[PDB]
Design a protein around this nucleic acid. Structure first.
Ligand SMILES: Cc1ccnc2c1NC(=O)c1cccnc1N2C1CC1
Ligand SMILES: [Mn+2]
Lengths: 412, 555
DNA sequence: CAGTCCCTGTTCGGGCGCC
RNA sequence: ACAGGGACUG
RNA sequence: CGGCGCCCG
């Protein structure tokens, strides 16, 4: 018997009617055993056909975990509760979190099951546990408590959270603590031993205040940005000069002081591609000055909080992936590369699922926001397996892309 | 006082709306005098009531007819009430496919009588029900009433029925873990691996549990009727099959004949392996009337023949044995058509199917295989909830070369090669690096938008030139056209340099078939050549001998 | 700038296969 | 029916 | 009249 913060679908839009996608039998077992136990706990409870709302749910195991975590795709709800969280209560994003030598991510979402949810709102958390082959109909529930992964859940628990944390922040003022949805980001410049100790300690804090917590470390101070770089060549074929010039034309979309003039003139006749053409000095210097403008930053690219982030991933081959985060074309907030991720050399979709997760992660540590992905993949491929490789408690936004490779020239 | 059978499910109205008042709409004049009596029956049973003042509610009548009846079935139209009634989460998400059922030793079907009128309507919503329909012809103006149960043609009748029935069954089932039930409409099908009589023990004990809730289970019920006939299916506990398919032999071919034909072939294709619709399907392109006359080409008939011979002998599916692995094997059937069989024990198939869909403007067998493999994986997850062992007409090196070169993220799950021809191959590969001692064709093309007129050509390191005039064309078509020339006029090994982002995008995706004859030709020239190199250089950058062929064709 | 087309690939209005 | 990308219009 | 699945603007 405690209060309940009323909550509202921002004006005009209805509850999510989004359909449940088919599940593997494996995951259906894990979901059944989790909801029946959670119903028994009165976290959720059964519902009828009078509630014509649905959110899709599936399940995952977190990285390095043999225990099943349930996961709801509340994206649609979060879109329809949004004005509530963004406009009513803002959360300041630590710019230092990214500068910490180590940052651990702990999953605190279970705590959210304490607070009740406005009885009038619960009908919009309705989710179906599907049946294999439609032999039974769906087991439909709705959330009684603060549902994991909805943006209101971390929002409403704010007071209580800031509370339970105030002892630690007070005892450890130099430790930076940020919160994004079901996840809590904790970071410090401590040597790893004593960090992990301060983490076990914080685990205790939330443990004695009534929470459970089923490595997680990140090293943001070590995060490198991948700059554009022109090849180092001993001797140049025509073909080299051409691919070089084309690249230069792109980079010149990004860095305006670029000129192709002397290398272009280097190309003057109609010549065999593999003929070896020597570099004039005037060109050698324009090219070296270009190699220079490409060590610079880009004037006037800065993050604007109000704009959505957009992240593009390109598949570069042989386990390599390049990515770029930007809110507006050609002004890139970050560029990067991944290699030898799980799935490298065997399963592309796995590697990509990983990239999307690592990217979302750096995106949250840096700007506190999940990006919109443009995935170099067919829609259907992605839907089928993306559900198979997912280890994260959140779900970024994505759309599907086809760009036969001329932007693949983001890496040699 | 009336009485109270089973828990009622709350129903609201789309906020700010209220019950209907309507004028009558035509229905046949003979059978409706019968309901005047039938109505008095319901008065006494609790399925109807009335009040004078309280109802500003009136509803019309529009009906649907059913074959195979020894008695006539009444109906009322709430369509105005319907549109004004809250939405529900629909309970029928579609139906299980036979191949997903586990073989069950004993399987019976009880058909629930007075099913819809057996479910209490929500107390307070009862009010919105009032209605009126013509006596025999008509004499005096009339009278009215209210509904106490789930009304025919109402939205919640189906939603709430399904859910209430389910709600009822839950406790029997929890008390009987090793039974297996499925509900379709008002029929329940029950099955078990227990012995035939104790199975019938629980069958009566359940007709008991349904009675305990006011649910009627007659003895017209059949242990002796199976196969059960359901939606084009014939189902026996041991084996299943499609209901017998009648293939039109008509000499006269109209496009609606071909339509029904196709739909029938595909429906046969779920069980009878190797069905092809391609050539029959080509006739259907861009036709205005469904009644039009079309002749059959020789291919489509040789195919229709092979298919008729497929239907000749009968066939049956097995059921799923969860203990044993699932195996799905695809054989390439050509003309961008594919077929698959999913079995567990060899030659006893669970099901077959086709994937024919030519996806994209230009495509290839690897892409298309990848597609079939995805279709099948999805389907398999729906039915058995798991992914199959692939038996695929493709060398692990063929495949590896494709997915590993391709720009898109692409994947096939755990699969094993089956050496069944024709095998899937990559018909050409573009070199990754320039070719020493090949002529370098710098190629370009241009057309004028207004006149839709243009020219395509090239220049080489050897002095060789060409420019060709072209009529009724586009800038793109000319850039493909110029690359084409450079293929034609080059030796076995050639380096091709082009400035068109468009053309490069197509060729670089290594299509083996295309809608576009020019691309087909390009493809064909490409296969013949020992080595090809495609290069891109930005236009009007004053490049290479690129400025030169740009001048040559822009003139 | 906007404003034109040319080419390509996923959501809704026609009809057949199963209720 | 809708969107993305190319290219041409002064 | 609908649901479900393919084929044409
Ligand atoms: C039509 C249908 C649909 C879904 N399941 C069943 C049936 N009826 C059967 O014919 C059936 C046959 C064999 C095994 N299970 C069956 N059952 C399962 C319930 C025991
Ligand atoms: Mn041109």
């Amino acid at each position: 018997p405690i209060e309940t913060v009323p909550v509202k679908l921002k004006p005009g839009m209805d509850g999510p009617k989004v359909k449940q996608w088919p599940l593997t039998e494996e995951k259906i077992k894990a979901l059944v055993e989790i909801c029946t136990e959670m119903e028994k706990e009165g976290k959720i409870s059964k519902i009828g056909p009078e509630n014509p709302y649905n959110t899709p749910v599936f399940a995952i195991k977190k990285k390095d975990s043999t225990k099943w975590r349930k996961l709801v795709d509340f994206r649609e709800l979060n879109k329809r509760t949004q004005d509530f969280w963004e406009v009513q209560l803002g959360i300041p994003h630590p710019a230092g979190l990214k500068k910490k030598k180590s940052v651990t991510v702990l999953d605190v979402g279970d705590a959210y099951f304490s607070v009740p949810l406005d009885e009038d709102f619960r009908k919009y958390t309705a989710f179906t546990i599907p049946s294999i082959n439609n032999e039974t109909p769906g087991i439909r529930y709705q959330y009684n408590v603060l549902p994991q992964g909805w943006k209101g859940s971390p929002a409403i628990f704010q007071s209580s959270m800031t509370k339970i944390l105030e002892p630690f922040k007070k005892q450890n003022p130099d430790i930076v603590i940020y919160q994004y949805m079901d996840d809590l980001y904790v970071g410090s410049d401590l040597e790893i031993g004593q960090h992990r100790t301060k983490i076990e300690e914080l685990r205790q804090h939330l443990l004695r205040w009534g929470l459970t917590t089923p490595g997680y470390e990140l090293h943001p101070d070590k995060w490198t940005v991948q700059p554009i770089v022109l090849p180092e060549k001993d001797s140049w074929t025509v073909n080299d000069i051409q691919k070089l010039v084309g690249k230069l034309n792109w980079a010149s979309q990004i860095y305006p002081g670029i000129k192709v003039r002397q290398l272009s003139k280097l190309l003057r006749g109609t010549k065999a591609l593999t003929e070896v053409i020597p570099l004039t000095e005037e060109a050698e210097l324009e090219l070296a000055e270009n190699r220079e403008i490409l060590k610079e930053p880009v004037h006037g690219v800065y993050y604007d909080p109000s704009k959505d982030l957009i992240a593009e991933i390109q598949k570069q081959g042989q386990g390599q992936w390049t990515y770029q985060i930007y809110q507006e074309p050609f002004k890139n907030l970050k560029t990067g590369k991944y290699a030898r991720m799980r799935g490298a050399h065997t399963n592309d979709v796995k590697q990509l699922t990983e990239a999307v997760q690592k990217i979302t992660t750096e995106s949250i540590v840096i700007w506190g926001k999940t990006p919109k992905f443009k995935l170099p993949i067919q829609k259907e491929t992605w839907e089928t397996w993306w559900t198979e490789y997912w280890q994260a408690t959140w779900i970024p936004e994505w759309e599907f892309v086809n760009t036969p490779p001329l932007v693949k020239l983001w890496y040699q | 006082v009336p009485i109270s059978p089973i828990e009622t499910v709350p129903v609201k109205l789309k906020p700010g709306m209220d019950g209907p008042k309507v004028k009558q709409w035509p229905l046949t004049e003979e059978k409706i005098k019968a309901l005047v009596e039938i109505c008095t029956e319901m008065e006494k049973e609790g399925k109807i009531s009335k009040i004078g003042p309280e109802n500003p509610y009136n509803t019309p009548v529009f009906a649907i007819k059913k074959k195979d009846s020894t008695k006539w079935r009444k109906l009322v139209d709430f369509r105005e009430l319907n549109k004004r009634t809250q939405d529900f989460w629909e309970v029928q998400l579609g139906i299980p496919h036979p191949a997903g059922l586990k073989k069950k030793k004993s399987v019976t079907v009880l058909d629930v009588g007075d099913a819809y009128f057996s479910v209490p309507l929500d107390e307070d919503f009862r009010k919105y029900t009032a209605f009126t329909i013509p006596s025999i012809n008509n004499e005096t103006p009339g009278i009215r009433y209210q509904y106490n149960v789930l009304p025919q043609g109402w939205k919640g009748s189906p939603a709430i029925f399904q859910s209430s029935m389910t709600k009822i069954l839950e406790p029997f089932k929890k008390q009987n873990p090793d039974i297996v039930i499925y509900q379709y409409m008002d029929d329940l099908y029950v099955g078990s691996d227990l012995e035939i009589g104790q199975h019938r023990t629980k069958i009566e004990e359940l007709r008991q549990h349904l009675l305990r809730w006011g649910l009627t289970t007659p003895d017209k019920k059949h242990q002796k009727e199976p196969p059960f006939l359901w939606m084009g299916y014939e189902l026996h506990p041991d084996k299943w099959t499609v209901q017998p398919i009648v293939l039109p032999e008509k000499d006269s071919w109209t496009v609606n004949d071909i339509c029904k034909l196709v739909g029938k072939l595909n429906w046969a294709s779920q069980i009878y392996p190797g069905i092809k619709v391609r050539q029959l399907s080509k006739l259907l392109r861009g036709t205005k009337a469904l009644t039009e006359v079309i002749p059959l080409t020789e291919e489509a008939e040789l195919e229709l023949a092979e298919n008729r011979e497929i239907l000749k002998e009968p066939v049956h599916g097995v059921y799923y044995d969860p203990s044993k692995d699932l195996i799905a094997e695809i054989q390439k059937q050509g003309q961008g058509q594919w077929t698959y069989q999913i079995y567990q024990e060899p030659f006893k198939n669970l099901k077959t199917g086709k994937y024919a869909r030519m996806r994209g403007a230009h495509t290839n067998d690897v892409k298309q295989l990848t597609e079939a493999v995805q279709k099948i994986t999805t389907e398999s997850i729906v039915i058995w909830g798991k992914t199959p062992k692939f038996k695929l007409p493709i060398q692990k090196e063929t495949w590896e070369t494709w997915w590993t070169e391709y720009w898109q993220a692409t994947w096939i799950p755990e699969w094993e090669f089956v050496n069944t021809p024709p095998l899937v191959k990559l018909w050409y590969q573009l070199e990754k690096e320039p070719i020493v001692g090949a002529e370098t064709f710098y190629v370009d093309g241009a057309a004028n938008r207004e006149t839709k007129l243009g020219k395509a050509g090239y220049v080489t390191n050897k002095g060789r030139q060409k420019v060709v005039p072209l009529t009724n064309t586009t800038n793109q078509k000319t850039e493909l056209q110029a690359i084409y020339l450079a293929l034609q006029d080059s030796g076995l090994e050639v380096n091709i340099v082009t400035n068109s982002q468009y053309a490069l995008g197509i060729i670089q995706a290594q299509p083996d078939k295309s809608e576009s004859e020019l691309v087909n030709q390009i493809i064909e020239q490409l296969i013949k050549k020992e080595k090809v190199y495609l290069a891109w250089v930005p236009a009007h950058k004053g490049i290479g001998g690129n400025e030169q062929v740009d001048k040559l064709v822009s003139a």
